[PDB]
RNA sequence: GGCGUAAAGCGCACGCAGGCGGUUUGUUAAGUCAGAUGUGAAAUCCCCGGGCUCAACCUGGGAACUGCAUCUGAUACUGGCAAGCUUGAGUCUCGUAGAGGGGGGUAGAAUUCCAGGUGUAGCGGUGAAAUGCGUAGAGAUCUGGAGGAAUACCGGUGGCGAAGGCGGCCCCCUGGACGAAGACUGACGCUCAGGUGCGAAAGCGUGGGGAGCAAACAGGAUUAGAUACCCUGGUAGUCCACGCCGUAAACGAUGUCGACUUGGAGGUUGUGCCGGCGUGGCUUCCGGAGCUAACGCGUUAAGUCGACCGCCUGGGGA
């Protein structure tokens, strides 16, 4: 999991206050950070199916939140997926 | 997930009457209030009130005649998976008129007799007997 | 009778929490040390209007059957029926007293013949062993049926202690439409009782209070 | 209409399309509703009359065609649009327990084997035997060494996991659950054909490893026979890495999600106020109503409901 400092950093970066932790951008960004971090774990631990199910849950949840943001506000969506380096 | 709050309200009424509960409570909605006004005005329930501003809670006071429940049978008819609309000429008769069907018309939620008198059709919400 | 004498003799004290009947919740006041308390404030009026119904019953010469069969309450119910001109049962309620009246009536006649023979010298000309068998049959027929021997037909009312201990008489009455007035504890099922009465149905003091209430009020009804 | 046991819940899931959608207002008027207009050929069905000597038959008159289109209107509900809201769903903080997973390491007990000290005639097996083993010194017992596999006690109708499954100890990487305080987002939800993934054991391929166990096989017994059950050996396999297979009575023979409906006695982990009373999550056993063909299930439903999916339609052939 992400440490407290990493969470605080991303939350300040993508939320529009120090206390905004529920907005779509923060959720998508936290999921993206954990996914990217775990890429190295699953390059070494290919048979770790049980943890990969949680990784896939993060991917599915980020997909859902990104599509929600897209149908709610396109501008914030493109800004997020350019900032986060996501294809779509 | 909850996808038919009207069904939940009919179920709460049915189950409360089967458990001899004096009154039932539930999250409120305007449409539930219209249904309950039809229920109370036709003598199926005793009273209802709404409490709360941001989260209204709707309480229905149930009634029993000789100890036994007044609501003999209540059923959802039109449901989210199968919506049911009838013209004014095809409004159903529940227990040959002893019961009622709650009909939502362009003039509001009313009974089958009232809908027939107003000369309107609409969605058939529930049978109550 | 009233809240004071009930709370003093031990009416209010109920059975343990793990034995209550969820149909007894409304008459429950509260709990203490995992034993229940019966709300006397409801006990008094329902009981007194049951006493009023019974007082009215005896005025129409309606025969009452006293039903209590606990070992320590046999003499209490028998005295209450003895001092009341009534019929009673204080040993095991035979299956068939009420719904099978046609056959129990024959054993009542048999007890009548043995009771004539008992005070008659009939058990002298017999060979001292058939007569002994007659005496033992008399003993058991008194133990069981010696409270309804003169009844002569079905009764009109029932008064019960521990409705579940005597649920067979309750069910027999409900089969025959005899209204029942039963002392219903927290651990009792009242769905078969028309006039129910909460109260400790085991404590001898409370039990003899209910018994004296019904006996005296039936005395009052027959006074009229 | 069904799917615990009669046929029937996919082994388990993620999830596109599809289906369905918490609550407030406005707006639309598509679905829905109302009215009208055009059309829906005649004949036929239906009714009330007539003449065939009556009926068949014919035929006068009268109703239906339950649809489609357009126009005019209503706006409760469903849909679209807009703004919201927080109760659903999710994020954060702190903490809690855990055989959840992947990797590495290590410890003790035991079996087997190798070398050795003591020592002699048995051991081993079984219903009884024999095969086997032992004077070329076994079995027993003591020491040293090698190796593989599994982790006694704890241990628990205990725990964790989507299911399959997961049990010594330590470390590294890692997933989820639950609890209590608030905040934050503001319907972001549920289900899911096709798709994709995971999936016991056995089995397959390549390379290793191999103590014990053990399909096959060999012998000895048993038996009428004994391709068995029992005994003595024993090879694949069981173990490891990677790939494949994709099936089990993969079972609760019970699909997932949400809501509601009397009670009693157990377990486990949180947390509240002073061993005592509160409030949470999962879990055992009984049982009420209800349901059920019955057996039984029974707030962890097989009860009362809603959303979606999967499946069944006599036995055999199959």
HEC letters along C110-140? HHHHHHHHHCCCCCCCCCCCHHHHHHHHHHH
**Under 8 Å CB-to-CB from A12, ≥6 apart: which residues?**
A18
Q: Which domains does chain B show, CATH number per domain?
A: 5-69 (3.30.1370.30), 74-128 (3.30.1490.10)
Look at chain B and count its residues: 129
Backbone phi, then psi, for C63, in 5-degree steps? -80, 135
DSSP string, A53-88: HHHHHHHHHHHHHHHHHHHH-HHHHHHHHHHTT---
CA B3, CA C92: separation in Å to the nearest integer? 58
Q: Which nucleotide is nearest to C31 (CA to C1')?
A: D277
CB C169 within 8 A of CB C93: yes
Distance C170 CA to D129 C1' (A): 74
Cα(C178)–Cα(C54) distance, integer angstroms: 13
**Helix, strand, or coil (residue B118):** coil
| Dihedral pair phi/psi, residue A5, rounded to 5° | -65, -40
Experimental method of this PDB entry: cryo-EM
DSSP single-letter state for residue C81: H
Contact A41, A51 (CB under 8 A): yes
Nucleotide nearest to A55 (CA to C1'): D175
Provide the CA A78 to C1' D26 distance, Å, integer: 30
- Maximum Cα–Cα distance across chain B: 41
Torsion angle (degrees, nearest 10) of CA C107, C108, C111, C112: -140
Rounded Cα–Cα distance for residues C95 and C98 (Å): 8
Nucleotide nearest to B25 (CA to C1'): D260
Alpha carbons C92 and C168: distance in angstroms, whole number: 10
Cα–Cα distance between C5 and C14 in angstroms, integer? Answer: 16
Q: In which element (H, E) is residue C167 found?
A: helix C167-176
Classify residue B79 by its DSSP letter.
Answer: B
Chains adjacent to C (≥3 CB pairs closer than 8 angstroms): none
- Measured CA to C1', the nucleotide nearest B75 is D305
Q: Please give the nucleotide, over all strands, whose C1' is closest to the CA of residue B29.
A: D23
> How far is it, in rounded angstroms, from Cα C152 to Cα B46?
50
Residue C186, judged by CB atoms within 10 A of its CB (0-12, 13-18, 19+), counts as: buried
Cβ burial of C47 (10 Å; 0-12, 13-18, 19+) is buried
User: How are beta strands B122-128 and B100-105 bridged, if at all?
Assistant: antiparallel
The residue that minimises its CA distance to C1' of D277 is C33
Resolution of the model in angstroms: 2.6
Q: C28, C36 in Cβ contact below 8 A? A: yes
Residues in chain C: 224
DSSP string, A6-60: HHHHHHHHHSSSTT--SSHHHHHHHHHHHHHHHHHHHHH-TT-HHHHHHHHHHHH
Report the nucleotide nearest the CA of residue A46, measured to C1': D102
- End-to-end, the C-alpha distance of chain B in Å comes to 28
Q: What angle do CA B61, B65, B68 make, to 5 degrees?
A: 90
C-alpha distance across the termini of chain C, in Å: 21
Question: Nearest residue (Cα to C1') for D257?
Answer: B1
Q: Under a CB-based contact definition with an 8 Å cutoff, are residues B122 and B129 in contact?
A: no
- DSSP codes joined into one string, C18-64: GG--GGGSTTEEEEETTEEEE-HHHHHHHHHHHHHHHHHHHHTTPPE
How far apart CA B112 and CA B39 sit, in angstroms, is 12
* Greatest Cα-to-Cα distance within chain A, rounded to the nearest angstrom: 40
Find and list the nucleotides of strand D having atoms within 7 Å of a protein beta carbon: 14-16, 19-25, 31-35, 73-78, 85-94, 100-103, 161-164, 173-176, 183-190, 197-199, 242-243, 257-265, 277, 288-289, 303-308
- Token representation of residue C95: 């299956």
Structure tokens at C65: 């059957």
- Cβ atoms of C63 and C87 closer than 8 Å: yes
Q: Among candidates B23, B52, B48, which has minimal Cα distance to B34?
A: B48
Q: What is the dihedral of CA B42, B46, B51, B53, to 10 degrees?
A: 0
Do strands C87-89 and C64-67 pair parallel, antiparallel, or not at all (unpaired)? parallel
Looking at residue B52, what DSSP letter applies? Answer: -
D5 C1' – A86 CA distance, angstroms? 54
Structural domain boundaries of chain A? Answer: 1-88
| Distance (Å, whole) CA C135 – CA C54 | 37
CA of B117 to C1' of D39 (A): 31
Q: Note whether C108 and C149 are within 8 A (CB).
A: yes
Distance A51 CA to D130 C1' (A): 59
What is the spatial distance between Cα B109 and Cα B98, in angstroms, rounded to a whole number? 19
Kindly state the tokens that stand for C184. Answer: 């219903």
- A3 CA – D128 C1', rounded, Å: 74
Helical spans, DSSP H, in B19-104? 30-41
Q: How far apart are CA C161 and CA C74, in angstroms?
A: 11
CA dist C180 and C197 (Å) reads 11
Task: Render the burial of C63-94: b for 16+ CB within 10 Å, e for the rest.
Answer: bbbbbbbbeebbebbbebbeebebbbbbeebe
Which chains are adjacent to chain B, needing at least 3 Cβ pairs under 8 Å?
A: none
* Nucleotide closest in space to A72 (CA vs C1'): D188
Interatomic distance B82 CA / D7 C1' (Å): 29
């Amino acid at each position: 999991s992400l440490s407290t400092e990493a969470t605080a950093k991303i939350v300040s970066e993508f939320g529009r206050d120090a206390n905004d932790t529920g907005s779509t951008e923060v959720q998508v960004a936290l999921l993206t950070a954990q996914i990217n971090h775990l890429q190295g774990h699953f390059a070494e631990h290919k048979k770790d199916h049980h943890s990969r199910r949680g990784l896939l849950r993060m991917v599915s949840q980020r997909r859902k939140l990104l599509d929600y943001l897209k149908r709610k506000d396109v501008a914030r969506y493109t800004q997020l997926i350019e900032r986060l380096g996501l294809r779509r | 997930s909850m996808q038919d709050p009207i069904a939940d309200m009919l179920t709460r009424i049915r189950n409360g009457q089967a458990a001899n509960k004096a009154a039932v409570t539930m999250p409120s909605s305007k449409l539930k209030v219209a249904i309950a006004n039809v229920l109370k005005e036709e003598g199926f329930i005793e009273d209802f009130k709404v409490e709360g501003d941001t989260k209204p809670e709707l309480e229905l006071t149930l009634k029993y005649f000789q100890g036994k429940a007044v609501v003999e049978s209540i059923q959802r008819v039109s449901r989210p998976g199968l919506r049911i609309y009838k013209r004014k000429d095809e409004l159903p008769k529940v227990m040959a008129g002893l019961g009622i069907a709650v009909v939502s018309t362009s003039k509001g939620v009313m009974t089958d007799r009232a809908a027939r008198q107003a000369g309107l059709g609409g969605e058939i919400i529930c049978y109550v007997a | 009778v009233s809240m004071r004498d009930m709370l003093k003799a031990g009416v209010h004290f109920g059975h343990q929490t793990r034995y209550w009947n969820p149909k007894m919740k409304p008459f429950i006041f509260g709990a203490r040390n995992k034993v229940h308390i019966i709300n006397l404030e409801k006990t008094v009026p329902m009981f007194n209007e049951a006493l009023a119904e019974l007082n009215k019953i005896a005025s129409r010469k309606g025969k009452i059957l006293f039903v209590g069969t606990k070992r320590a309450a046999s003499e209490a119910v028998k005295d209450a029926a003895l001092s009341c001109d009534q019929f009673f049962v204080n040993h095991r309620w035979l299956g068939g007293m009420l719904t099978n009246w046609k056959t129990v009536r024959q054993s009542i006649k048999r007890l009548k013949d043995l009771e004539t023979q008992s005070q008659d010298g009939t058990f002298d000309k017999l060979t001292k062993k058939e007569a002994l068998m007659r005496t033992r049959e008399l003993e058991k027929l008194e133990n069981s049926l010696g409270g309804i021997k003169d009844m002569g037909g079905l009764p009109d009312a029932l008064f019960v202690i521990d409705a579940d201990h005597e649920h067979i008489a309750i069910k027999e009455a409900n089969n025959l439409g005899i209204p029942v007035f039963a002392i219903v504890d927290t651990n009792s099922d009242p769905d078969g009782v028309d006039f129910v009465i909460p109260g400790n149905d085991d404590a001898i003091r409370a039990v003899t209070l209910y018994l004296g209430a019904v006996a005296a009020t039936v005395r009052e009804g027959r006074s009229q």
